Design a protein around this nucleic acid. Structure first.
Length: 490
DNA sequence: AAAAAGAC
DNA sequence: TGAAAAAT
DNA sequence: AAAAATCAAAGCT
């Protein structure tokens, strides 16, 4: 695009844009039923069904091999939801799926698959370019003065909700979204997308006070979904860009913050103590915010504020160190955070205190929620919040690595390796193909450390950026690049 | 103050 | 981000 | 020639 949105004036806050024009979504391609050859079964009794139930069944059919289907709770979710998706008659006869047979059905898809994985170059070629056609008329809205790419115009297809970890809602059917379920976000003056024949939109408005050009509420969690622009997009960028500016600022105004909490460790007001600790933890252990979740529709996962007592154990001496806090619990997406970390005596003793008289199920930091934690932070700094920190130490600890593990004389190839070695040290705290076959890729890089840093480093040493950042990822940082000099210090 | 709706 | 598909 | 190795769920009245 060669667009330099940053080189352009600052938006008057709240206001996201002046102009916006998009062609609406791309509704999921409708269900084409199974041909007579391919059929169902149930007690051997090969019997056809309602198209609705059919498609629904297919879902299950396409995951029998998958452990989800082997998951009990998941199954209940299926069975029940399915019933609803079919006729009384059927509903009557299939009193038991634990007698059904999707095997045949599985086969077809796998077949159709291998078939597709056998389709002619020319045959497919048509579709390839054909599919490309779609984008041009469906993948680029029109905002303010430029044509940017959208995240995804293709609406989330109906299906079977896959829930990470022991999600109590895993196995429930998603659903096929209709125009009647859609909300268009335009700009009264722009050419509003005309809803598909017969149908009407749910609602259409122009709140330029938001990002997304289109959205709807998912049924499962009854949560909202939205179609928003691309990362390379200004809108999606400036936030992220100024996102680092934030951490960039606590950076100074932090040592102070620390004193405060360490000092706060000796407070009289409980909550004040409870708070300080949490920060400390997050500070060091880089723990996440810890929002309170609805004990049911949620998949029980804790966080710094949302920590329960059972999640920790304290050892006054252990592994040679004193006042050790043993952390075990599953965070986001139920990813167990196990750790043995030595803390300040006061914390230890305070912790020891926070536990006093409580049940395992009792929240560790009772008299404390995320909201509070941030309210405090806010008064200490504008826009200060738990997130900021992870973002902080991340891009900062790194800032030193490429200062340390980097050799002046060193060759690029070497330098490169020298670089990667820096990032290792980074994820060394987040707890996040030979020596690595368990650690994730970008993740941190993906959105945790100020790229400006990587940039000025390439400059300060003459490293062809392309080496570390590909086009697509360089596209996202298409500014940090342009706007940066080896003399950059986050 | 508080549950709900939202937005990124 | 994570799971998953896709590009000797 | 072939085989093998490199999208969407979850969380600031």
């Amino acid at each position: 695009q060669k667009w330099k949105w940053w080189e352009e004036e600052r938006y008057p806050e709240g206001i996201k844009w002046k102009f916006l024009e998009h062609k609406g979504p791309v509704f999921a391609p409708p269900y084409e039923p199974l041909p007579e050859n391919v059929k169902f079964y149930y007690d051997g009794k090969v019997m056809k069904l309602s198209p609705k139930a059919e498609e629904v069944a297919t879902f299950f059919a396409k995951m029998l091999d998958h452990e989800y289907t082997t998951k009990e709770i998941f199954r209940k979710n299926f069975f029940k939801d399915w019933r609803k998706e079919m006729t009384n008659e059927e509903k009557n006869i299939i009193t038991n799926l634990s007698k059904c047979d999707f095997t045949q059905m599985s086969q077809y898809f796998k077949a159709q698959t291998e078939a597709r994985k056998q389709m002619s170059k020319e045959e497919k070629l048509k579709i390839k370019e054909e599919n490309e056609k779609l984008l041009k008329e469906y993948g680029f809205c029109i905002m303010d003065n430029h044509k940017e790419r959208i995240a995804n115009f293709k609406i989330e297809p109906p299906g079977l909700f896959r829930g990470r970890g022991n999600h109590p809602k895993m196995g429930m059917l998603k659903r096929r979204i209709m125009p009647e379920d859609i909300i268009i976000n335009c700009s009264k003056d722009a050419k509003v997308p005309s809803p598909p024949p017969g149908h009407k939109w749910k609602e259409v408005r122009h709140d330029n006070k938001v990002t997304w050009l289109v959205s709807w509420t998912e049924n499962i969690q009854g949560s909202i979904k939205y179609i928003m622009l691309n990362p390379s997009s200004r809108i999606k960028g400036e936030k992220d860009w100024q996102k680092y500016e934030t951490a960039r600022r606590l950076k100074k105004c932090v040592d102070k913050i620390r004193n405060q909490y360490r000092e706060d460790w000796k407070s009289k007001e409980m909550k004040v103590r409870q708070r300080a600790v949490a920060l400390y933890f997050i500070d060091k252990l880089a723990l996440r915010a810890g929002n309170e979740k609805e004990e049911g529709e949620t998949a029980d996962t804790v966080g710094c504020c949302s920590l329960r007592v059972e999640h920790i154990n304290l050892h006054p001496e252990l592994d040679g160190q004193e006042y050790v806090v043993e952390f075990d619990f599953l965070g986001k997406d139920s990813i167990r955070y196990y750790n043995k970390v030595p803390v300040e005596k006061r914390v230890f003793k305070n912790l020891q205190l926070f536990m006093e008289n409580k049940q395992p199920e009792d929240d560790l930091f009772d008299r404390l929620n995320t909201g509070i934690l941030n309210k405090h932070l806010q008064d200490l700094m504008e826009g200060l919040t738990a997130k900021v920190f992870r973002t902080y130490n991340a891009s900062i600890t790194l800032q030193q690595q490429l200062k340390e593990l980097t050799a002046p004389d060193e060759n690029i190839p070497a330098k490169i390796l020298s670089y990667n070695r820096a990032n290792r040290a980074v994820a060394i705290l987040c707890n996040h193909r030979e020596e690595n076959k368990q650690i994730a890729l970008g993740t941190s890089k993906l959105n945790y450390l100020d790229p400006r840093i990587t940039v000025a480093w390439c400059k300060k040493w003459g490293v062809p950026i392309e080496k570390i950042y590909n086009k697509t990822q360089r596209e996202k940082f298409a500014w940090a690049i342009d706007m940066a000099d080896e003399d950059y210090e986050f």
